Design a binder for these strands. Structure first.
Ligand SMILES: O=c1ccn([C@@H]2O[C@H](COP(=O)(O)OP(=O)(O)O)[C@@H](O)[C@H]2O)c(=O)[nH]1
Ligand SMILES: [Mg+2]
Length: 351
DNA sequence: GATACTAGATAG
DNA sequence: CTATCTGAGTATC
């Protein structure tokens, strides 16, 4: 059994970028199941073999991490063109890891074709004809299908909590008690404003010491519909392998998602947050049935509620400690099922 | 005359 | 929101 994993639109090198981190992690946890896997990317590296030096068809399984098809500057993007060309040569089933509802697989030829540099490529190089199997992070396959409604070789869908991988790594450990410097914290990107309203609500104009790490920038929040005066402290991005330690700097860490993450997705940050020394607080709308934890104290409806809950968490260590003890318990139960998870994942890639 | 990393705006 | 169009701003071996 020879397994190849690749990121469709992002180069893979180390933990600098997130897409690069997800691919290496996915690479690791799969190797940890006792499988021989390679990461194919743009060049040879510590963790990667080059697309130009490997016969894609020497792999019994081709796993592909989801990405958009973004020709920045209206210019050719080597990351996307090289992986698709690679996928295009494969003749066996392709397993697409759909972890971001906004990153459904789609052919790039239709796009390249109508570009002024179409003459640089051809349909025979870019068109991916192999049958594709979508492995949705969301249990609601109906939505998964709809996101891939326009692609015909996508003929198989299956739910599987891909993003539980962090808590199932071999070296995984919950964070230790940490000296606090913040009341609330949140890590991530602007995600094209799909959460601008939620970010402003829970992180802007609160009076608390809030920090928003990640690639998001203060100047990106300019929608008059969601005005602000006092913004949280914007610090840049940090390696993915450190996120949970970063959250641990605050009393609490916010959980918010897009419109279609609500009661459908249980994202990675949920585990990264739940794993930290930061009391996890979820936006009510994100999980309206409280499926994550059967304890209303972990849920906030608005700014005022978040502000009340954070203040009551500082006002009392018995409460903060209790809530950190509970969430850690919920996580540790899910970790008890590692084998079960590993099993459904193999069966997910037909093993 | 740097290189790498990172969707945004708009009609239907 | 969804389908389709249009094309660079920011951080740094
Ligand atoms: O500086 C940062 C900020 C975020 N992340 C990762 O990015 C994820 C969040 O991605 P996104 O902003 O797309 O939000 P999501 O859709 O996952 O809720 C986090 O869970 C981390 O894994 C990271 O590695 N470094
Ligand atoms: Mg994700």
């Amino acid at each position: 059994m020879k397994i190849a994993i690749i990121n469709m639109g992002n180069n893979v090198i180390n933990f600098k970028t997130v897409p690069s981190s997800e691919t290496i992690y996915l690479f690791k946890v799969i190797s940890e199941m006792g499988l021989n896997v390679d990461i194919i990317s743009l060049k040879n590296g510590v963790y990667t073999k080059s697309f130009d030096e490997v016969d894609v068809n020497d792999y019994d399984r081709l796993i592909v991490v989801n990405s958009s098809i973004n020709f920045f500057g209206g210019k050719p993007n080597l990351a996307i063109l090289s992986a698709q060309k690679f996928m295009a040569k494969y003749k066996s089933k392709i397993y697409y890891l759909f972890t971001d509802i906004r990153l459904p697989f789609s052919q790039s030829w239709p796009n390249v074709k109508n570009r002024p540099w179409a003459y640089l490529y051809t349909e025979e190089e870019l068109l991916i004809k192999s049958p594709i199997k979508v492995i949705s992070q969301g249990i609601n396959l109906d939505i998964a299908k709809a996101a891939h409604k326009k692609v015909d070789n996508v003929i198989e869908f299956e739910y599987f909590p891909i993003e539980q991988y962090k808590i199932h790594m071999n070296d995984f450990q919950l964070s230790k008690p940490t000296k606090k410097t913040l009341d609330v914290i949140y890590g991530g990107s602007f995600r094209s404003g799909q959460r601008e309203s939620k970010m402003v609500e829970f992180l802007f104009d609160t009076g608390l010491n809030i920090e928003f790490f990640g690639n998001a920038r203060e100047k990106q929040f300019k929608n008059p519909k969601y005005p602000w005066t006092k913004a949280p402290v914007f610090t840049g991005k940090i390696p993915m392998n450190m996120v949970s330690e970063k959250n641990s700097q605050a009393i609490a860490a916010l959980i918010i998602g897009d419109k279609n993450y609500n009661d459908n997705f249980i994202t990675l940050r949920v585990w990264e947050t739940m794993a930290s020394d930061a009391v996890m607080l979820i936006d009510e709308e994100f999980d309206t049935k409280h499926r994550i934890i059967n304890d209303a104290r972990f849920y906030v409806n608005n700014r005022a509620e978040l502000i009340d809950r954070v203040n009551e968490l500082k006002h009392s260590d018995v409460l903060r400690k209790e809530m950190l003890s509970i969430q850690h318990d919920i996580l540790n139960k899910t970790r008890a099922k590692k084998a079960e998870w590993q099993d459904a994942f193999k069966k997910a890639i037909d093993l």
